């Protein structure tokens with residue numbers, strides 16, 4: 001019944017977005033540390049209903065590789081979302097530009113990413129904006145899928161919904177999102193995970209946009225893998241990427257089969 005600021009000390013700005021801010025908050029009596037996403041519902045006409053949907057999706061989630069939702073408050077136009085504080089920051093900041101990261105680290109992050117995406121898809125949720133900026137790390141560098149503001153239900157009461165809305169981030173979106181009027185949700189998340197893995201192993205994104213207009217994408221379809229970023233990627237993970245970054249979503253590898261992939265299961269040393 002008392003104000004947010006009387007219970008919570010904002011200690012640190014963690015991130016700044018167009019529609020909200022994320023603060024590290026410390027409870028003034030408990031001293032427990034929390035991430036609070038502060039959202040001014042004045043900044044968009046349908047933000048009230050968009051943030052309500054984000055909260056309803058968050059309340060369905062409970063997995064070690066998904067940022068945990070603790071609750072929410074409203075104070076006038078302000079919505080507070082309390083989330084698991086991820087001390088380790090963004091996966092994005094572990095990706096050295098043009099370099100990437102050690103293959104064992106990339107593999108480990110990929111394992112954890114798959115675990116979270118499998119969980120989400122199992123409860124019928126698609127994230128729709130998977131990228132290193134939305135994959136956070138806890139104090140033990142465990143990966144946690146973050147930000148469900150673009151997430152939606154693709155399976156409900158055992159019936160699948162095809163998607164028809166364009167959203168996400170252009171270097172990470174699957175080509176069917178640019179070309180088809182309707183598309184299945186799961187292969188889109190699979191595709192973006194493959195871009196994430198490409199970024200982890202090479203430190204760069206392969207194309208602006210998986211368009212016929214984009215030469216980098218056409219060179220990939222012609223498997224000119226002597227070019228960058230592919231030449232930086234060992235043939236074993238590259239064989240997996242060849243199975244993920246497949247244009248036709250009906251032929252694209254599914255996660256159950258990613259789990260059977262040689263590199264996925266290859267023991268790696270430092």
Ligand SMILES: Nc1ncnc2c1ncn2[C@@H]1O[C@H](COP(=O)(O)OP(=O)(O)OP(O)(O)=S)[C@@H](O)[C@H]1O
Nearest residue numbers: 014015017018019020022035083084085086133147
């Ligand atoms: N739970 C968290 N723990 C630690 N850091 C976080 C957490 N949530 C967000 N951040 C940081 O805040 C940044 C932005 O938060 P997001 O939720 O991704 O905001 P955004 O989507 O960029 O902003 P808008 O308003 O949706 S355009 C992230 O990239 C993290 O660096």
Ligand SMILES: [Mg+2]
Nearest residue numbers: 133134146147
């Ligand atoms: Mg985000």
Ligand SMILES: [Mg+2]
Nearest residue numbers: 017147149150
């Ligand atoms: Mg967001």
